[PDB]
């Protein structure tokens, strides 16, 4: 957990859900990210997918909104470190509903940044790598 923040990271310090840490902007982003409706706990199964991580994995919509929230924040240095630790180190994935992937378009470092699909079959929930910060 970050010095001066309540919500950013596993576990939490806060007493009420309305309470925010030192930084008005970064802690709001982390609070919104930690209140994602659809998550998957460690070892939880949902939507035909099983996550095999000790940390909870979240939906790609929450991660995209969290990315935009951190990139548009006013306090640059705290949001910078939170983004560079969450998105770029742990090598997590996000799950969303998409046509079945046929192959990876562009793979840079250990992650696929553009993928390709078959438009012929229906949509299914699948894992996708997270963009870097």
């Amino acid at each position: 957990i970050y010095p001066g923040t309540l919500w950013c990271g596993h576990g939490n310090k806060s007493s009420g859900p309305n309470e925010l840490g030192r930084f008005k902007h970064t802690d709001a982003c982390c609070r919104t990210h930690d209140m994602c409706p659809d998550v998957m706990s460690a070892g939880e199964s949902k939507h035909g997918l099983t996550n095999t991580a000790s940390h909870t994995r979240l939906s790609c919509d929450c991660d995209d909104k969290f990315y935009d929230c951190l990139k548009n924040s006013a306090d640059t240095i705290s949001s910078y470190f939170v983004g560079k630790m969450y998105f770029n180190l742990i090598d997590t994935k996000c799950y969303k509903l998409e046509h079945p992937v046929t192959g990876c378009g562009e793979r840079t470092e250990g992650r696929c940044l553009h993928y390709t699909v078959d438009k012929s079959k229906p949509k299914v929930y699948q894992w996708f790598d997270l963009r870097k910060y």
């Epitope: 909104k65 969290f66 990139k71 553009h114 390709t116 996708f128």
Partner: nanobody, 127 residues
């Protein structure tokens, strides 16, 4: 704030060659993929081409594979769509689009991948 502006277009005879150029401004250019979308009168604005930030992966729509070429100049922050051997049923409005900021990986085969769009220029094949 960002600004995407096109150049090129108009009427050209069947078989002729034309390239549209699209200049972006406001942010870093090389990070974000960019693409070109084709809207015929009375149809969904479908994508015709897209190119990644690095340039190493491009995706073309099946209707136009092998006739169009896509490229970018990161120093001038521009993207070029070259077109050759134009055929009927290809006259349309061509829009220039840029990949928005995303936390997850996205496909270039979707409208929802691109946030910033230009006004686009008309392309007319007449003979």
């Amino acid at each position: 704030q960002v600004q995407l502006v096109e150049s090129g277009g108009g009427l050209v005879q069947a078989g002729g060659s034309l390239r549209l150029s699209c200049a972006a401004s406001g942010r870093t250019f090389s990070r974000y993929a960019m693409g070109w979308f084709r809207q015929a009168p009375g149809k969904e604005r479908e994508f015709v081409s897209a190119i990644s930030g690095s340039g190493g992966f491009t995706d073309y729509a099946d209707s136009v594979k092998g006739r169009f070429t896509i490229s970018r100049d990161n120093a001038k922050s521009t993207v070029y769509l070259r077109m050759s051997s134009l055929k009927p049923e290809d006259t349309a409005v061509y829009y220039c689009a840029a990949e928005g900021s995303r936390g997850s990986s996205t496909r270039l085969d979707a409208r929802g991948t691109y946030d910033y769009w230009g006004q686009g220029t008309q392309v007319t094949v007449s003979s």
